[PDB]
Amino acid sequence: AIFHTGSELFIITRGPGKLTLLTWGGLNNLRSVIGAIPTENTGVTKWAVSFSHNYTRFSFIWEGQGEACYQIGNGLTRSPVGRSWSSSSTIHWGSSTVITEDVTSVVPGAVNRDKVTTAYALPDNL
Amino acid sequence: AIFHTGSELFIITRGPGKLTLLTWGGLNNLRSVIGAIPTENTGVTKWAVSFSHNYTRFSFIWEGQGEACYQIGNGLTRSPVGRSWSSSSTIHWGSSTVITEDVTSVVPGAVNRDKVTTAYALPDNL
Amino acid sequence: AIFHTGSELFIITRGPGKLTLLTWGGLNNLRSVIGAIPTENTGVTKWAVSFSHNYTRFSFIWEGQGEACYQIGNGLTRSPVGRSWSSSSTIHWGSSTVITEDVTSVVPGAVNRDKVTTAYALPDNL
Amino acid sequence: AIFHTGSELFIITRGPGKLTLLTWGGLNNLRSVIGAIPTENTGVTKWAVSFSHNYTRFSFIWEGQGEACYQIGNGLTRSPVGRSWSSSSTIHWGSSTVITEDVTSVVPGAVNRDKVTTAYALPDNL
Amino acid sequence: AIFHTGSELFIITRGPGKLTLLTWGGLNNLRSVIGAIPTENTGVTKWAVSFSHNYTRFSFIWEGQGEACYQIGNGLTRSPVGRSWSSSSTIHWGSSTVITEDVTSVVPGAVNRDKVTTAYALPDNL
Amino acid sequence: AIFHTGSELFIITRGPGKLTLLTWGGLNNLRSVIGAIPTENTGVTKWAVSFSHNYTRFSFIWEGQGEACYQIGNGLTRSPVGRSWSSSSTIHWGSSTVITEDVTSVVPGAVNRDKVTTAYALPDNL
Ligand SMILES: CC(=O)N[C@@H]1[C@@H](O[C@@H]2O[C@H](CO)[C@H](O)[C@H](O)[C@H]2O[C@@H]2O[C@@H](C)[C@@H](O)[C@@H](O)[C@@H]2O)[C@H](O)[C@@H](CO)O[C@H]1O
Ligand SMILES: CC(=O)N[C@@H]1[C@@H](O[C@@H]2O[C@H](CO)[C@H](O)[C@H](O)[C@H]2O[C@@H]2O[C@@H](C)[C@@H](O)[C@@H](O)[C@@H]2O)[C@H](O)[C@@H](CO)O[C@H]1O
Ligand SMILES: CC(=O)N[C@@H]1[C@@H](O[C@@H]2O[C@H](CO)[C@H](O)[C@H](O)[C@H]2O[C@@H]2O[C@@H](C)[C@@H](O)[C@@H](O)[C@@H]2O)[C@H](O)[C@@H](CO)O[C@H]1O
Ligand SMILES: CC(=O)N[C@@H]1[C@@H](O[C@@H]2O[C@H](CO)[C@H](O)[C@H](O)[C@H]2O[C@@H]2O[C@@H](C)[C@@H](O)[C@@H](O)[C@@H]2O)[C@H](O)[C@@H](CO)O[C@H]1O
Numbered sequence: 001a002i003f004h005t006g007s008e009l010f011i012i013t014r015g016p017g018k019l020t021l022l023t024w025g026g027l028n029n030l031r032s033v034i035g036a037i038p039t040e041n042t043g044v045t046k047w048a049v050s051f052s053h054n055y056t057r058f059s060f061i062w063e064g065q066g067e068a069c070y071q072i073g074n075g076l077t078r079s080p081v082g083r084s085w086s087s088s089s090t091i092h093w094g095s096s097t098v099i100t101e102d103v104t105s106v107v108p109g110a111v112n113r114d115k116v117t118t119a120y121a122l123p124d125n126l
Numbered sequence: 127a128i129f130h131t132g133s134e135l136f137i138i139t140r141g142p143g144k145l146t147l148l149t150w151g152g153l154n155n156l157r158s159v160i161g162a163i164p165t166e167n168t169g170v171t172k173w174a175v176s177f178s179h180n181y182t183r184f185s186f187i188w189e190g191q192g193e194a195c196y197q198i199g200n201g202l203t204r205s206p207v208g209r210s211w212s213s214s215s216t217i218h219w220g221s222s223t224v225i226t227e228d229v230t231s232v233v234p235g236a237v238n239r240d241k242v243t244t245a246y247a248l249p250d251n252l
Numbered sequence: 253a254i255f256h257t258g259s260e261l262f263i264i265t266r267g268p269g270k271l272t273l274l275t276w277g278g279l280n281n282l283r284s285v286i287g288a289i290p291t292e293n294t295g296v297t298k299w300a301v302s303f304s305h306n307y308t309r310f311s312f313i314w315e316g317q318g319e320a321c322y323q324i325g326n327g328l329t330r331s332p333v334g335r336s337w338s339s340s341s342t343i344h345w346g347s348s349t350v351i352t353e354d355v356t357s358v359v360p361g362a363v364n365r366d367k368v369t370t371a372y373a374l375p376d377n378l
Numbered sequence: 379a380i381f382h383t384g385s386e387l388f389i390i391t392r393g394p395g396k397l398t399l400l401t402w403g404g405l406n407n408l409r410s411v412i413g414a415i416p417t418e419n420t421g422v423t424k425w426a427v428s429f430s431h432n433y434t435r436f437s438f439i440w441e442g443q444g445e446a447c448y449q450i451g452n453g454l455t456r457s458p459v460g461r462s463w464s465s466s467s468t469i470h471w472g473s474s475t476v477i478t479e480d481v482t483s484v485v486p487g488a489v490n491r492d493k494v495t496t497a498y499a500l501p502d503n504l
Numbered sequence: 505a506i507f508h509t510g511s512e513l514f515i516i517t518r519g520p521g522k523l524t525l526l527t528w529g530g531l532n533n534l535r536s537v538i539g540a541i542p543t544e545n546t547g548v549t550k551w552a553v554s555f556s557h558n559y560t561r562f563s564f565i566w567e568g569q570g571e572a573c574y575q576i577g578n579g580l581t582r583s584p585v586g587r588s589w590s591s592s593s594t595i596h597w598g599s600s601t602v603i604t605e606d607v608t609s610v611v612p613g614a615v616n617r618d619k620v621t622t623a624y625a626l627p628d629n630l
Numbered sequence: 631a632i633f634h635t636g637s638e639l640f641i642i643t644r645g646p647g648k649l650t651l652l653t654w655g656g657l658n659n660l661r662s663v664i665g666a667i668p669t670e671n672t673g674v675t676k677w678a679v680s681f682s683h684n685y686t687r688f689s690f691i692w693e694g695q696g697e698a699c700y701q702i703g704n705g706l707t708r709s710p711v712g713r714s715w716s717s718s719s720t721i722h723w724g725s726s727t728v729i730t731e732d733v734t735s736v737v738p739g740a741v742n743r744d745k746v747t748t749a750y751a752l753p754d755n756l
C-alpha cells in the first residue's frame with residue numbers, strides 16, 4: 001500500500017511550478033486541506049509527499065510547464081502526475097495504485113494551507 | 127516555522143536502525159500515533175519527516191549504533207537527534223527549533239502504526 | 253525520433269540480469285544480430301542503448317528478475333521494458349515511441365553477439 | 379577489446395562543443411558515416427560512444443574550447459580525446475587501445491548524420 | 505584527534521566567500537602562515553582542510569554572506585565556523601574538538617600565502 | 631603550480647589499500663615525514679592530498695591490487711599513481727606537473743606518521 005515503508009510517494013519535476021496536495025476523506029468529519037508548494041528550481045526537483053493520519057484520500061496535481069512524474073518507493077517506474085483536478089492523481093488509503101480521479105467538487109471546501117502542507121521539495125545539500 | 131516550505135525537516139543517519147515518530151497533541155481527542163520506520167542501510171540514509179494535519183506535537187528518536195542528525199531546509203547545520211523518549215527531539219507546532227523533551231508519559235496511550243507513519247527513508251534511485 | 257540527440261535511449265534496472273538487444277530490419281541484405289549484455293550489480297544499473305547504422309528495427313528485453321524501465325532523453329517518465337520476445341520493447345527507425353512488438357520470428361535467424369552488442373552499462377565512476 | 383562488456387567507451391567533456399564520430403571500414407562496401415553531436419552544457423558532460431555492427435573502424439574528435447577525455451569501462455584512467463581529424467582518437471575493431479590516427483582521407487566520403495549517430499550525452503536525471 | 509585518519513577536517517559553505525587558514529605554534533621558530541582561499545560558487549562548496557607538519561595550532565575563519573559549517577571525518581554533525589580572528593575556529597594539535605580562540609595577536613607575524621595554503625575546495629568532477 | 635588554488639591534488643582509487651605520502655625537501659633542517667593512509671573501501675575512494683608548509687618535495691604511492699590515478703584541480707585527465715618508492719609520483723614545489731622519482735634513499739630516515747599525515751580519504755557524506 002502506498003505510504004507504507006517501501007512504498008513511499010516521491011515526485012520528480014522539471015522547472016518551476018507548484019505541487020498542490022488535497023488531503024480529504026477525513027475520519028469523523030475532519031476538514032479537508034489544500035496547499036500549494038512552490039519550486040523556483042530551473043532543473044529537476046525531487047519531492048517527498050506524505051499523508052496525514054486520520055485521512056483516507058490524497059489527491060495532487062502539478063501546475064508548471066515542465067514534466068512531473070511520481071515514483072513509488074525505490075520502484076523504477078515514473079508515471080505522469082495529474083495536471084488538473086478533473087484528472088487529479090489520487091490515492092485511496094490502503095491502495096497500492098495512483099488513479100486518475102475528478103476531485104473538483106472537494107477543492108473549494110478545503111482549508112487553504114499554502115506552503116504548510118505535507119509535501120516537501122528536497123534541497124541541494126541533503 | 128519548521129514544516130513550512132523552506133524549513134522542511136530532514137534527518138541523516140548512519141547504519142541500520144529505526145527512526146520512530148510520535149505524533150501527539152491532537153486536536154479534538156485525536157489519538158496519538160507512534161510508528162517505527164526501519165532502515166537496513168550500512169551507510170548513510172537520508173529521511174524526510176512530515177507532520178500530520180490537526181496535530182500539534184511531533185517527537186522523534188533514533189535507535190541505532192550510528193549517528194543521527196537533523197537538518198532544517200537547506201541550512202548547513204546538522205544537529206543530533208534524541209536517542210530515547212526521555213530526551214526526544216520534539217517540535218511544538220509553529221516553532222522554528224527542535225527541543226529536547228521527555229514524552230515517556232505520551233507513549234503508552236499512542237496507537238502503534240510501525241512502518242506506516244509520516245517519516246520516510248529516501249531510496250537509492252531518487 | 254528516438255536515438256536522435258535529445259531523445260537518447262536509456263534503461264534503468266534493479267539487480268543482476270541480461271539486457272538483450274535484437275538489431276534487425278537491416279538494409280543491403282544485412283544479417284540481424286542478437287546479443288545479451290549481463291550486469292552483476294545488486295542495485296540500480298543505468299544503461300545507454302544505441303542503434304547501429306543501416307538497421308531499421310531495434311528490439312530489446314530484460315531477462316533479469318528485477319524491474320527494468322526506459323527513459324527517453326532527459327524526460328522524467330520511466331516505463332517498463334519488455335520481458336519476452338513476444339512482448340519486446342521495439343523501436344521502428346524514425347519513431348518517437350517504444351512499442352510492444354512480437355519479434356519471435358526474427359530471433360532464430362540472428363547471429364549471436366553476446367557481450368558485444370550496442371547496449372552498455374554505465375560504471376560507478378562516471 | 380573496446381566495446382565489449384567491461385570495456386565500454388565513455389567520454390567526459392567540459393563546456394559546450396561537438397563530439398563527432400566517424401564510423402568507417404564498413405564490411406561489403408557499407409557507406410562510412412560522420413555525425414556531430416552537440417552539448418550546450420557549461421560544465422561537465424558524460425557521454426556513451428557506441429560502435430555500429432558491420433563496421434571495423436571508429437574515430438572521434440572533440441571540437442570545443444574545453445577539455446575532453448575518454449575512459450574505458452570502470453577504468454580510472456582518463457586520457458585526452460583527439461581535437462582534429464588528422465589526430466583523431468581511433469579504435470580498430472578488436473583492439474583494447476584507443477590510438478591516434480589521421481582519418482582526413484576517410485571524412486570526405488562519409489554520409490552526414492549530424493545529431494543522429496551512435497554517441498550520446500547523458501542527461502542530468504540519469 | 506582531528507586530522508588523524510577517521511577525523512579529517514571538512515568544511516561546507518554556501519555562496520561565495522573566502523576561507524582563511526592560520527598555521528601557527530610552529531616548532532623551531534617556523535614562521536606562522538596565513539592564506540585566504542576564495543570560492544565564487546553560488547551554491548554549496550565542500551572543502552578539505554589539512555594541517556602542516558611541525559605546527560601545533562590551526563585556526564580558520566569564513567568571510568562570506570552565507571553559512572559555513574565544519575564536519576569531522578564521516579561524522580554527521582555540522583557546526584558553525586568562526587567569522588573573525590577574535591572568534592576563530594581553532595584546533596590545538598592532538599585535540600579531538602574545534603574551540604573558539606582569539607588569535608588576533610598571531611595574525612600580524614604571519615607570512616601571507618593567499619591561494620597557496622592547506623585548504624582546498626573540492627571540484628564538480630571528483 | 632600544483633597545490634595552488636585551482637590546481638589542488640586529488641587521487642581516485644579502487645578497492646582497499648594504502649596511500650603513502652613522503653613529505654621531504656624540508657627547509658630549516660626539517661626531518662622528512664612518511665605516513666600511510668589506509669582505506670577498507672571495496673569501491674572507489676576519492677582523496678585530497680595536501681602539502682605541508684616549509685617542504686619542497688612531495689612523493690606518494692598507492693599499494694593495493696586496484697588502480698589509482700591523480701587529477702589536478704577540476705581537470706578531466708586522470709593519470710596513474712606510482713606503485714613503489716623507486717617509481718613514486720613526485721611533485722617538486724612550484725611545478726605544474728607530477729613526475730616519477732626514485733625516493734627510496736629518503737624513506738628509511740623519514741619519521742613514521744602513519745594515519746596522521748596530510749592525505750585524506752573523502753567520506754560518503756560530503
Ligand atoms: C490502520 C488503518 O489505517 N486503519 C484505517 C481506518 O482508520 C482507523 O479506524 C479506527 C476505527 O475503526 C480508528 O478510528 C483509527 O483511529 C483509524 O486510524 C487512523 O486513521 C487512519 C486513516 C490512519 O491514518 C491511521 O494511522 C490513523 O491511526 C479506517 O476507518 C478504514 C476505512 O477508512 O481504513 C483503515 O485502513
Ligand atoms: C493554521 C494553523 O496551523 N493553526 C494552528 C491551530 O490549528 C487550527 O485551529 C483551528 C481553530 O482555531 C482549527 O481547529 C483548524 O482546523 C486547526 O488547523 C488544523 O490543525 C493545525 C494543527 C494544522 O495541522 C492545520 O493545517 C490544520 O488545518 C492550532 O490549534 C494551534 C495550536 O497552538 O496552532 C495554530 O498554529
Ligand atoms: C537518413 C536515414 O536515416 N534514412 C533512412 C533510410 O536509410 C537510408 O536509405 C538510403 C537509400 O534510400 C541509403 O541506403 C542509406 O545508406 C540509408 O541510411 C543508412 O541506414 C539508415 C537506417 C540509418 O542508419 C543511416 O544513418 C544510414 O546511413 C531508410 O532506408 C528509410 C527506410 O527505412 O528510413 C530512412 O529514415
Ligand atoms: C565476430 C566479429 O566481430 N567478427 C569480425 C568480422 O566480421 C564478421 O565477418 C563475418 C565474415 O567472416 C560475417 O560477415 C559477420 O557478419 C561479420 O560480423 C559483423 O561485423 C562485425 C564487424 C561485427 O560488427 C559483428 O558483430 C557483425 O556481426 C570482421 O570481418 C573482422 C574484420 O576486422 O573482425 C572480426 O572480429
Ligand SMILES: CC(=O)N[C@@H]1[C@@H](O[C@@H]2O[C@H](CO)[C@H](O)[C@H](O)[C@H]2O[C@@H]2O[C@@H](C)[C@@H](O)[C@@H](O)[C@@H]2O)[C@H](O)[C@@H](CO)O[C@H]1O
Pocket residue numbers: 531556557558559560597598661663741743
Ligand atoms: C607525534 C607528534 O605529533 N608529536 C608532537 C610533538 O612534535 C614532535 O616533537 C618531537 C620532539 O619531541 C620532534 O621535534 C618531532 O619532529 C615533532 O613532530 C613533528 O611536529 C608535530 C607537531 C607533528 O606535525 C609531527 O607530524 C611532526 O613530525 C610536539 O613537540 C608535542 C608538544 O606540542 O606534541 C606532540 O604531539
Ligand SMILES: CC(=O)N[C@@H]1[C@@H](O[C@@H]2O[C@H](CO)[C@H](O)[C@H](O)[C@H]2O[C@@H]2O[C@@H](C)[C@@H](O)[C@@H](O)[C@@H]2O)[C@H](O)[C@@H](CO)O[C@H]1O
Pocket residue numbers: 535537615617620657682683684685686723724
Ligand atoms: C613562497 C614560496 O613558496 N617560496 C618558496 C621558498 O620557500 C620560502 O623560502 C624562504 C627563504 O628563501 C623562507 O625559508 C620561507 O619560509 C619559505 O617559505 C615557506 O616554505 C615554502 C616551501 C612554502 O611552504 C611557503 O608557504 C612557506 O612559507 C623556497 O625556498 C623556494 C626554493 O625551494 O621555493 C619557493 O617557491
